Design a protein around this ligand. Structure first.
Ligand SMILES: *[C@@H]1O[C@H](CO)[C@@H](O[C@@H]2O[C@H](CO)[C@@H](O[C@@H]3O[C@H](CO)[C@@H](O)[C@H](O)[C@@H]3O)[C@H](O)[C@H]2NC(C)=O)[C@H](O)[C@H]1NC(C)=O
Ligand SMILES: *[C@@H]1O[C@H](CO)[C@@H](O[C@@H]2O[C@H](CO)[C@@H](O)[C@H](O)[C@H]2NC(C)=O)[C@H](O)[C@H]1NC(C)=O
Ligand code: CU
Ligand code: CU
Ligand code: CU
Ligand code: CU
Length: 499
């Protein structure tokens, strides 16, 4: 069952063995991935998060972010630790009480403290549209049509040794999959369809790092949604999906009753499908209970290319149709050296006082805000352009902006911008060396919004800045509940921090 929009959510430690290897984890709702939180567009979500964590090897504090939800007027509920709140301490709870006006689509929730989401605190978050303009394109859309793609590690996130390369040990599709080394024939996930029906498959990357080449043998996939944004129908036979991105696609169960491999090839870790790694099963009702015998092509016919996507609605692009044609045109210098990432020369290290609390306490320019050089002000009611030229090691980097979606004026691997009808989304690959992926949005949401690479290891290593949007209006726009005001005193007491 789906839970929400008003629900408790307990965060616990437990052992799990999703690939046959047992390790402790950080779980929401007792499972990996966590249960789906759901409601309808415009609903009030009240997710009362109970931190019941006791194992310090995965951190006993926590904070949860609702990825892709704009949090307008509720910046305090956004979740990034030391940006919008202090963490929740063990044995305490906190009500994330917010609304989702004007949004409907496929989202997710995840820990936003350290690398803790890698240890298991990740799950789907769906905002249904009772009047969905895409409703007639499919018959079935429910918890059974959500497909999560996850990287899973045997080594605990906090225990990844300094100086050694980090790669995963298994790809998990809907929570199950097989280990790349010492592979055992542990159970694979099964997605069941009925011949003749059409399904809204909600594809969610809950990855901490790799991108996946996702396909389903024998089938093609008609994209209708991109990171919460309805798209024109785009038929593809493979989707390269980066960390934290989502797509809805229509799956027409139009092949012979049988079993078909579902494939999710990460860009690192195990290559191929030997022993059933990187795999799940699409099973038609009435098929034999047995593994598929299908193969992939050598070369896919119609891979997703981001410039092929266009909004369903007439969203256009704000600003003027040329580089720098915005009220506040930015170009970020994104770099890596010596184990740390930097943006404009500054590596992100979370501050002691959350940025939002610093603003509410009266710090009103971004040069006043800590960490110094990591907080950049944005003016209100303005068109912002952010160029994100690639080149930094560890690419391709998926960059994500809290509080907003954005027009992708320039995509990876294509030097031509699009000022007419590009897709809008919230997480974008910035591509490869020489690329100039560029985003645009308008500032109508006062508060500090994190901009960061969504490879969690890179975030931890400093690949982030905070956009302090409309500092002057942040306090009036975001009244805070007493429970939020209580978070930093409780956290600092528990941790013996003075501030
Ligand atoms: C590289 O990115 C650019 C920019 O997003 C892509 O260019 C765009 O290509 C589309 C598809 O060919 C062009 O639109 C089509 O325009 C014709 C009018 O000539 C119209 O008949 C069709 O209905 C269709 O919409 C679009 O004008 C063009 N935009 C720009 C700014 O050049 C390009 O396709 C990408 N390259 C690759 C290899 O995908
Ligand atoms: C990416 O695009 C931005 C503009 O959106 C380019 O920025 C210009 O950079 C040059 C120097 O490299 C400056 O003289 C201009 O003031 C910048 N802004 C403009 C022209 O609008 C940037 O060079 C591009 N980067 C790459 C790697 O292609
Ligand atoms: Cu987010
Ligand atoms: Cu996120
Ligand atoms: Cu990165
Ligand atoms: Cu984030």
């Amino acid at each position: 069952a789906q839970i929400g929009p008003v629900t408790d959510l307990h965060i616990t430690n437990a052992n799990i063995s999703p690939d046959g290897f047992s390790r402790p984890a950080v779980l929401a709702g007792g499972t990996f991935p966590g249960p789906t939180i759901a409601g309808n567009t415009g609903d009030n979500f009240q997710i009362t998060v109970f931190n019941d964590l006791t194992d310090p090897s995965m951190l006993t504090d926590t904070s949860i972010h609702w990825h892709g939800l704009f949090q307008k007027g509720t910046n305090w509920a956004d979740g990034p630790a030391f940006v919008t709140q202090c963490p929740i301490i063990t044995g305490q709870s906190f009500d994330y009480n917010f609304n989702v006006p004007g949004q409907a689509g496929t989202f997710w929730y995840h820990s936003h403290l350290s690398t803790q989401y890698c240890d298991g605190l990740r799950g789907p978050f769906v905002v249904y549209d009772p009047n969905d303009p895409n409703a007639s394109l499919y018959d079935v859309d429910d918890d059974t049509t959500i497909i999560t793609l996850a990287d899973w590690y045997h080594t605990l996130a906090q225990q990844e040794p300094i100086g050694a390369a980090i790669t995963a040990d298994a790809t998990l599709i809907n929570g199950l999959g097989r280990s790349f080394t010492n592979t055992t024939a542990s159970p694979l996930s099964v997605i069941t369809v009925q011949s003749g029906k059409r399904y809204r498959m909600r594809l969610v990357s809950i990855s901490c790092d790799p991108n996946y080449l996702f396909s389903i043998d024998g089938h093609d996939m008609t994209i209708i949604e991109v990171d919460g944004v309805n798209s024109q129908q785009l038929t593809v036979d493979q989707i390269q999906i980066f960390a934290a991105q989502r797509y809805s696609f229509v799956l027409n169960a139009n092949q012979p009753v049988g079993n078909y491999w579902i494939r999710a090839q990460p860009n690192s870790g195990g290559q191929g499908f030997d022993g059933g790694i990187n795999s799940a099963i699409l099973r038609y009702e009435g098929a034999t209970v047995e593994d598929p015998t299908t193969t992939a092509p050598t070369t896919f016919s119609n891979p997703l290319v981001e410039t092929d996507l266009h909004p369903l609605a007439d969203l256009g692009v704000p600003g003027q149709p040329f580089r720098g044609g915005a009220d506040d045109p930015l170009v970020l210098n994104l770099a890596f050296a010596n184990g740390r990432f930097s943006i404009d020369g500054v590596s992100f290290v979370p501050p002691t006082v959350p940025v939002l609390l610093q603003i509410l306490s009266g710090a009103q320019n971004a040069q006043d805000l800590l960490p110094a050089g990591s907080v950049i002000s944005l003016p209100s009611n303005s068109v912002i352009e952010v160029a994100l030229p690639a080149g930094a090691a560890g690419g391709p980097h998926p960059f994500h902006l809290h509080g907003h979606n954005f027009a992708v004026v320039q995509s990876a691997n294509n030097a031509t911008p699009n000022y007419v009808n590009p897709i809008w989304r919230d997480t974008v690959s910035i591509g490869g060396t020489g690329d100039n992926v560029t985003i645009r949005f308008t500032t109508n949401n006062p508060g500090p919004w994190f901009l960061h690479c969504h490879i969690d290891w890179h975030l931890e290593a400093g690949f982030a800045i905070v956009f302090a949007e409309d500092i002057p209006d942040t306090a009036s726009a975001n009244p805070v509940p007493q429970a939020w005001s209580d978070l930093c005193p409780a956290y600092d007491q528990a941790h013996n921090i003075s501030a």
